[PDB]
Amino acid sequence: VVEVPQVTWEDIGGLEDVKRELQELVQYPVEHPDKFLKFGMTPSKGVLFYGPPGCGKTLLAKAIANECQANFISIKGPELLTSEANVREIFDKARQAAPCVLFFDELDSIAKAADRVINQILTEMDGMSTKKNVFIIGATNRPDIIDPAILRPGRLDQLIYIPLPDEKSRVAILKANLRKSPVAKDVDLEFLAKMTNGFSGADLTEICQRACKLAIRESIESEIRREREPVPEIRRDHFEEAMRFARRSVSDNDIRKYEMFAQTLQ
């Protein structure tokens, strides 16, 4: 299904720098149209996100579409395998659906025949002007094997690091996830963020999911027995019990590799 996503910038904890850069990248063509004309600048055709899994790359792509009131079409790399007019149909349907965000996920799987499913993509990209109102986003967990062709000018205009959250970003991820939930005053998300160094945004969300299930199940069971003869809250002890099944999903070894790659790009 193709639709405007309901994810906003507010649902995304941390990454405040990346967010302002992305807003300007899409707001400037429409907010200062007379200045984009005077100096002869073309709006951007795409970006590429990279980083450890579960840290917000898909969320950012959806929030960009919600910003532009645009449709979102998501395509996972492995499923382009049956077959090179596959690459052509997708660009048609995205052009049909304009203004549209076209998101290529798991592009590490294609970086490894398949040699020019890539080449069919580069040709669709050059053949599609910015006047078509399609904005391309890719993501990958394997920045080491990115073909630099997809980044030459006229294609994806920026490569952007989305890292594991630091301590302040973990507090924000926790708050954004719980923003419309009834949380008890005895829970200290700043202490929770301290105890979860190395956790991804997805790892943090699961803790929030379990703690909520625990309070709802407890609500069920207690009314069932008071049946024998006031909105309930998610309490500190629900979070205490959710933490038992909590451990990092990204290894210290992969983090080093990601940090080397990004630090050498200074």
Ligand X SMILES: CN1CCN(C(=O)c2ccc(F)c(F)c2)CC1
Beta strands in 100-223 (DSSP E): 100-105, 134-140, 159-161
| From ligand X, Na ion, ligand ADP, none, interface partner of 13 (C-beta below 5 to 8 A by class) | ligand ADP
Q: Is 147 in the site for ligand X (CB under 6 A)?
A: no
Q: Among residues 93, 95, 142, 155, which is the contact residue for ligand X, using CB under 6 A? A: 142
Q: For the chain, what is the radius of gyration of the CA atoms?
A: 22
The residue among 211 and 250 lying less far from ligand X, judged by its C-beta, is: 250
Residue 176 makes CB contacts below 8 A (sequence gap 6+) with 10, 11, 12, 13
CB 193 within 8 A of CB 167: yes
- Counting contacts by CB under 6 A, is residue 254 touching ligand X? yes
Handedness of CA 128, 23, 6, 137 (dihedral sign): positive
Which residues are registered as beta bridge partners of 161?
50
59 annotated as ligand-binding? yes
Nearer to ligand ADP, 166 or 188 (CB): 166
Q: Is 55 annotated as a binding residue?
A: yes
The one-character DSSP state at 210 is H
Would you say 82 or 264 has its CB closer to ligand X?
264
Of the pair 3, 126, the CB lying nearest ligand ADP is at 3
Smallest separation, CB 141 to Na ion (Å) = 4
> Does 13 belong to an annotated binding site?
no
**Torsion angle in degrees (nearest 10) through CA of 60, 63, 68, 69:** 150
CB of 169 to ligand X, least distance (A): 19
Stretch that binds ligand X, among 68-76, 109-117, 125-133, 142-150 (CB under 6 A): 142-150
Is-contact 188 238, C-beta < 8 A? no
Residue 58 assigned ligand-binding role: yes
State yes or no: residue 135 binds ligand X (CB under 6 A): no
* 140 binds ligand X, rule: CB under 6 A: no
Nearest CA-CA partner of 67 in 10, 21, 8: 8
Among 16, 24, 31, 144, binds ligand X (CB under 6 A): 144
28 binds ligand X (CB under 6 A): no
**Burial class (CB within 10 angstroms; exposed 0-12, middle 13-18, buried 19+) of 126:** exposed
User: Known binding site for ATP: residues?
Assistant: 54-59
Annotated binding site: 54-59
Q: Which residues bind ligand X (CB under 6 A)?
A: 141-144, 254, 257-258, 261
